[PDB]
Amino acid sequence: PKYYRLKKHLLDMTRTQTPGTPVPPERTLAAEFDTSRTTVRQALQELVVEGRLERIQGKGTFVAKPKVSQALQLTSYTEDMRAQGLEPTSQLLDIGYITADDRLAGLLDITAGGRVLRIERLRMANGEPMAIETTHLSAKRFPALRRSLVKYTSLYTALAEVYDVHLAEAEETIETSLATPREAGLLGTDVGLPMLMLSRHSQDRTGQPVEWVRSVYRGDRYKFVARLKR
Amino acid sequence: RVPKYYRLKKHLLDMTRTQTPGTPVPPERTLAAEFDTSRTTVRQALQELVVEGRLERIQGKGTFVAKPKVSQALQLTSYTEDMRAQGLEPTSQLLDIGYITADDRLAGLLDITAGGRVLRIERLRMANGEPMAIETTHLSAKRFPALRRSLVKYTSLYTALAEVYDVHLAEAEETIETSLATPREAGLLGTDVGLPMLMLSRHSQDRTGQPVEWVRSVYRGDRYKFVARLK
């Protein structure tokens, strides 16, 4: 009751206020509406996750820009950021070989203990981290892939030119996830901010598995768009 | 500390990979005592696992190892067949219906004059009796004046649209994002209030390129996920 109108005014204070506007202090809001101070957290955290507010860990919480959009599709992260007026940067967090547990093997259609190239990228937009993306490929199926990536910006450019392998279909899973400590750290958010967790099974033009990708997108700043028929 | 979070989460994880669904998790206070870790940490690890779909919270009962999340293909077509595949049977329950006054965005979506009346429908979707989602459809009252009376005579909003009007969903744009369960939502779904949801916004067009519906929906993030086929 006291909660709804609170949310309603706050929701209406976005819409119109431009990003950067500081949100009134949580303890001020509790009195300005004679509501409990936890009822204020709730309303605010909803509006952070719903993307109208944004928490800056040193500074505070402010009216936010709309969430960044990306199409549910095998497509360019760079082209989509740019189309929205955002400079896209990436950062190679790690790249190394590992050995699959039995299921990563099931995914990659390789033997337990099989060697796997792993790649972790931090995706940025205007220099603000948005996602962490971890890609797994069968090292044996792609003998010297890492060494070849030196001379390439796009992993999928590398696979097409060098291995004559093109992504042709993917099964993709979208679900919720809380930001783990390691995740929150790389992304500069709270533990555990709600996340969009994407899992991608990709197969090429002759139908064999190419990669398995595990990705978490900031739930406060990100959304995905799908376009459907009939 | 940090190690304690890892060890507690490693442990419960292994429990989920080696015990059958339904296997009961000790209550939070037991875990804190057995792991000599703050209740904060225990709640966090528990919460990560529930949202990931590994553990399931049941309000009056407790936490258990879970069956996997319910999956639904992103597609205009049948919610029902896919549900029946995974071993669930879908049922719905009309929660509310009536007319409301459109805001400017709603008017923009539905292509009407702000203040124009909007038929609003609200259903609760369950799987094996268990609440999964709240689905809220918005249609232009001016465009479909006869629609609301029609509904009682049809199993589906869309056959109604196809029957009374010659109106068919041709295309749609769907947005997926994160949301926290509001108190009304948590109430109707039988979940906690802070629960991460998958919020689905749908904007549908008929064959002639005209807006038909705007649908806002929430799926409980602990029991639910979406699958898309990309090509």
Author numbering:
A (entry chain A): 22 to 251
B (entry chain B): 20 to 250
Paper excerpt:
While full-length DasR encompasses a homodimer in the asymmetric unit, DasR-EBD crystallised with only one monomer in the asymmetric unit and forms a homodimer with a crystallographically related neighbouring monomer. In contrast, β-strand β* is present in ligand-free full-length DasR and as a consequence, this ligand-free structure displays an ‘upwards’-directed positioning of the DBDs. However, in the case of ligand-free full-length DasR the DBDs are ‘upwards’-directed despite the fact that the effector-binding pocket is empty. The effector-binding pocket extends across both monomers in ligand-free DasR-EBD and encompasses a total solvent-accessible volume of about 440 Å3 (220 Å3 per monomer). This contiguous pocket becomes segregated into two individual pockets once β-strand β* is formed in each chain in ligand-free dimeric DasR, however, without reducing the size of the individual pockets (about 260 Å3 per monomer). At a first glance, the overall positioning of the DBDs in ligand-free full-length DasR resembles that observed in NagR in complex with potential effector molecules. However, also in this case, the centres of mass of the DBDs are shifted by about 13 to 15 Å between both structures. Interestingly, the overall pairwise orientation of the DBDs in ligand-free full-length DasR resembles that previously observed in the crystal structure of isolated NagR-DBDs in complex with palindromic dsDNA. Thus, binding of DasR to DNA with ‘upwards’-oriented DBDs is sterically impeded when assuming that DasR binding to operator DNA induces a similar conformational distortion in the DNA than NagR. Taken together, these data suggest that the crystal structure of ligand-free full-length DasR represents a DNA-binding incompetent conformation.
